Design an enzyme around this catalytic site. Structure first.
Site, PDB file in Angstrom:
ATOM      1  N   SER A   1      -6.730  -2.154   0.904  1.00 16.83           N
ATOM      2  CA  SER A   1      -7.442  -1.107   0.505  1.00 16.83           C
ATOM      3  C   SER A   1      -8.927  -1.155   0.452  1.00 16.83           C
ATOM      4  O   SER A   1      -9.676  -0.239   0.342  1.00 16.83           O
ATOM      5  CB  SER A   1      -6.859  -0.325  -0.550  1.00 16.83           C
TER       6      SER A   1
ATOM      7  N   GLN B   1       1.792   7.082   0.444  1.00 14.17           N
ATOM      8  CA  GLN B   1       2.118   6.551   1.698  1.00 14.17           C
ATOM      9  C   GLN B   1       2.319   7.849   2.787  1.00 14.17           C
ATOM     10  O   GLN B   1       2.962   8.747   2.445  1.00 14.17           O
ATOM     11  CB  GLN B   1       3.483   5.757   1.980  1.00 14.17           C
TER      12      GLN B   1
ATOM     13  N   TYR C   1      -4.435   8.989  -5.486  1.00 18.17           N
ATOM     14  CA  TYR C   1      -4.789   7.895  -4.628  1.00 18.17           C
ATOM     15  C   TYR C   1      -3.850   8.086  -3.592  1.00 18.17           C
ATOM     16  O   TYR C   1      -2.735   7.893  -3.735  1.00 18.17           O
ATOM     17  CB  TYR C   1      -4.864   6.750  -5.394  1.00 18.17           C
TER      18      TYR C   1
ATOM     19  N   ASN D   1      -3.000   6.953   0.995  1.00 16.47           N
ATOM     20  CA  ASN D   1      -3.532   6.849   2.045  1.00 16.47           C
ATOM     21  C   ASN D   1      -3.237   7.775   3.413  1.00 16.47           C
ATOM     22  O   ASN D   1      -4.145   7.653   4.030  1.00 16.47           O
ATOM     23  CB  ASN D   1      -2.659   5.624   2.620  1.00 16.47           C
TER      24      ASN D   1
ATOM     25  N   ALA E   1      -4.877  -4.394  -1.601  1.00 14.50           N
ATOM     26  CA  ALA E   1      -3.649  -5.148  -1.564  1.00 14.50           C
ATOM     27  C   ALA E   1      -3.036  -4.978  -0.239  1.00 14.50           C
ATOM     28  O   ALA E   1      -3.009  -3.761   0.227  1.00 14.50           O
ATOM     29  CB  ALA E   1      -2.658  -4.851  -2.629  1.00 14.50           C
TER      30      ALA E   1
ATOM     31  N   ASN F   1      -0.784 -11.086  -3.335  1.00 13.91           N
ATOM     32  CA  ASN F   1      -0.635  -9.844  -4.184  1.00 13.91           C
ATOM     33  C   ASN F   1      -0.478 -10.018  -5.604  1.00 13.91           C
ATOM     34  O   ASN F   1       0.704 -10.104  -5.888  1.00 13.91           O
ATOM     35  CB  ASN F   1      -0.211  -8.584  -3.506  1.00 13.91           C
TER      36      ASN F   1
HETATM   37  B1  VA1 Z   1      -4.421  -0.389  -0.877  1.00 13.27           B
HETATM   38  O1  VA1 Z   1      -4.745   0.086  -2.401  1.00 13.27           O
HETATM   39  O2  VA1 Z   1      -4.389  -1.743  -0.870  1.00 13.27           O
HETATM   40  C1  VA1 Z   1      -3.058   0.248  -0.296  1.00 13.27           C
HETATM   41  C2  VA1 Z   1      -2.552  -0.275   0.894  1.00 13.27           C
HETATM   42  C3  VA1 Z   1      -1.097   0.360   1.109  1.00 13.27           C
HETATM   43  C4  VA1 Z   1      -0.730   1.186  -0.161  1.00 13.27           C
HETATM   44  C5  VA1 Z   1       0.581   1.733  -0.229  1.00 13.27           C
HETATM   45  C6  VA1 Z   1       1.375   1.793   1.014  1.00 13.27           C
HETATM   46  C7  VA1 Z   1       0.823   0.792   2.030  1.00 13.27           C
HETATM   47  C8  VA1 Z   1       1.721   0.804   3.439  1.00 13.27           C
HETATM   48  N1  VA1 Z   1       2.441   1.998   3.950  1.00 13.27           N
HETATM   49  C9  VA1 Z   1       1.550   3.100   4.305  1.00 13.27           C
HETATM   50  O3  VA1 Z   1       0.937   4.000   3.771  1.00 13.27           O
HETATM   51  C10 VA1 Z   1       3.701   2.308   3.941  1.00 13.27           C
HETATM   52  O4  VA1 Z   1       4.179   3.009   3.014  1.00 13.27           O
HETATM   53  C11 VA1 Z   1      -0.458   0.321   2.150  1.00 13.27           C
HETATM   54  S1  VA1 Z   1      -1.923   1.106  -1.354  1.00 13.27           S
END
Ligand code: VA1
Ligand code: VA1
Lengths: 358, 347
Positions: free
Chosen positions: B61, B117, B147, B149, B304, B329
């Site tokens: 992220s 997600q 929050y 994606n 992460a 992670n």
């Molecule tokens: B970030 O805060 O580092 C994030 C990257 C992801 C998160 C949640 C889920 C996924 C992978 N995904 C797609 O949305 C599958 O469910 C990546 S938080």
């Protein structure tokens, strides 16, 4: 100057002076970023003193663009936020109607019907507090735009509070000097008085009289050379070395409100380029320019749009001014006259010139 | 490296690595505007390859900060406006819930409850369309942050449409290249594969798997040196030559919403500095109009993937920042605590 410019200026402005009976006039055309100057008639008719590049004209409300840029500079310095309540900077302003009125509202005439003029009986700061404490809104904040000295004038006064500087000292120090506007003044000093033109109203020689929030709302006097640099700086703020001033200028050209085809910045007003000339021309008539109009919030504000016609009219009792520029064309104009003639004649002339040159 | 920087970095990160059992780590401290690099452990445990200044890590992220800046750049270009409705850049989004949902709401996770997600079953662009058509908001736009994606990812996809370039092409030409981030990739090319660290989840070597809107929400891989230069760029946007990019950075650090102590930017999240080291659907307060980038802030983002954990924090006022990249992670609070120990000592 290039013959294209000499041609269109002489064909447009020279007859305008005849038609409107303007005693004296200075004009700058910025073309590909470079200023070209034109002068006519007298700064002082009795003494037959001609208009020169050192002649000081009263800017009237073109001063609001200096106030908007000073305010934007105080935002970039982190001294103020436009989201902040008015009363955070004026703690004695406690009446409940001020509650949801922010610096943004004051800067953009959207507080809910603050009046065009501060009544002339309002002289002391004590008088001013009572005026604002007693004011009753015609509308809720952020619903109507009503062009007003008592709105942007207060913004200006409160914007400089955190810095502890007086409005004039903040302006000289943070705006006029970094831009090298060495002949631009809120209060014209003794050494400059022989360059300070007379304004003319019904054939009498006049200067603007003091009034509450005059410095903040309509109090700048300047020369055609300084005004051309003003336009240069606003045309390309990234060329400016002082970081907060550079951001200040872009903040003053952001679009906070839309009313019809017009956008309200801080002091500056903007339309998308290309523009409909009837709109800007008829829109500058006081019947429209001074009337309440519904506003749409731009959430969040659009940053300075390059493809814009950015402009502002100004008038005092004896003077009429106009500034317009298009950042995308590196093109602009400044029109300083020592008679207050109708706004639509100014914009029409400016459009004829800039349209011929774009 | 000044011995002071050397001492605080090693005193802090060494116990961190041992406590969290992190296979490999890279750190850059930015001090008075200049980067200092530190490396530990393994990029690939089985091939005994060390972490170097050229190792690529998944940012997760932290990719959202690039997406927010690229969207900010598109605004500065006049290609998009944050005030514009989502449906202006996706006409086929005709479902009525999309009415007053703007690009702002998408960028800032305030659209009304778009999911963390995008469902793993969404594997085509008409799959993606159906997903957003059928999505039922829990809340009015601009009232709660969740929050997501599916929220910022969509913003990134829409922001590049006027340009006509793919998201990857626009990120490269408009952000990576102008900033000289020549070892930063949405897709790691075969030339760089030998520098691509493995992530480790429960002892298994893993890379991020393909997913809808991955590029836009969590798809960037970078080195500690490029990440340091990313921090320098964000610490002083006005040194950047590219006008629209300079403005784009400043827009990404503007404060659009407040929840508790935190301000939501575009990708970036901010708190006022100095900050207590110690400061989920959350109601938000709109900041009207948004506050332009504040120098006196702690600007930061965690990221992460299954096998990686990253963190970036910087304080523009102090010319100070840090990047921590690990191929495990491990808990966010451990990252932030180490980052704060390091930066508090240097300020
Ligand atoms: B970030 O805060 O580092 C994030 C990257 C992801 C998160 C949640 C889920 C996924 C992978 N995904 C797609 O949305 C599958 O469910 C990546 S938080
Ligand atoms: B501007 O648009 O050029 C303006 C300057 C003034 C306006 C209204 C009133 C005054 C000052 N005044 C009394 O208040 C003059 O008599 C200046 S609009």
């Amino acid at each position: 100057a290039p013959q294209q410019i000499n041609d269109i200026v002489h064909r447009t402005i020279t007859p305008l002076i005849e038609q409107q009976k303007i005693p004296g006039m200075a004009v700058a055309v910025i073309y590909q970023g470079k200023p070209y100057y034109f002068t006519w008639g007298y700064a002082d008719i009795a003494k037959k003193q001609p208009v020169t590049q050192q002649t000081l004209f009263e800017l009237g409300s073109v001063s609001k663009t200096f106030t908007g840029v000073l305010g934007g500079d105080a935002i970039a310095r982190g001294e103020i936020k436009l989201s902040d309540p008015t009363t955070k900077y004026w703690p004695e302003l406690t009446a409940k109607q001020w509650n949801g009125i922010t610096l943004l509202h004051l800067a953009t005439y959207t507080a809910g019907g603050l009046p065009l003029q501060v009544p002339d009986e309002v002289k002391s700061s004590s008088d001013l507090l009572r005026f604002y404490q007693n004011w009753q809104p015609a509308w809720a904040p952020g619903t109507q735009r009503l062009y007003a000295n008592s709105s942007i004038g207060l913004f200006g006064a409160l914007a400089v509070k955190p810095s502890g500087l007086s409005f004039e000292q903040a302006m000289q120090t943070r705006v006029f000097q970094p831009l090298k506007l060495n002949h631009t003044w809120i209060n014209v000093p003794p050494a400059e008085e022989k360059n300070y033109a007379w304004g003319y109203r019904e054939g009498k020689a006049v200067h603007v009289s003091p009034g509450a929030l005059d410095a903040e709302a309509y109090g700048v006097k300047s020369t055609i050379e300084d005004m051309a640099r003003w336009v240069q700086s606003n045309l390309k703020p990234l060329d400016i070395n002082e970081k907060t001033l550079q951001q200040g200028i872009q903040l003053a050209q952001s679009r906070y409100w839309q009313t019809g085809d017009m956008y309200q910045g801080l002091g500056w007003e903007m339309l998308d380029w290309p523009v409909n000339p009837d709109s800007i021309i008829n829109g500058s008539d006081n019947k429209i320019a001074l009337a309440a109009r519904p506003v749409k919030a731009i959430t969040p504000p659009t940053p300075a749009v390059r493809a814009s016609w950015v402009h502002k009219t100004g008038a005092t009792g004896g003077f009429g001014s106009y500034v317009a520029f298009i950042p995308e064309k590196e093109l602009g104009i400044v029109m300083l006259a020592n008679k207050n003639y109708p706004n639509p004649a100014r914009v029409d002339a400016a459009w004829q010139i800039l349209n011929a040159l774009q």
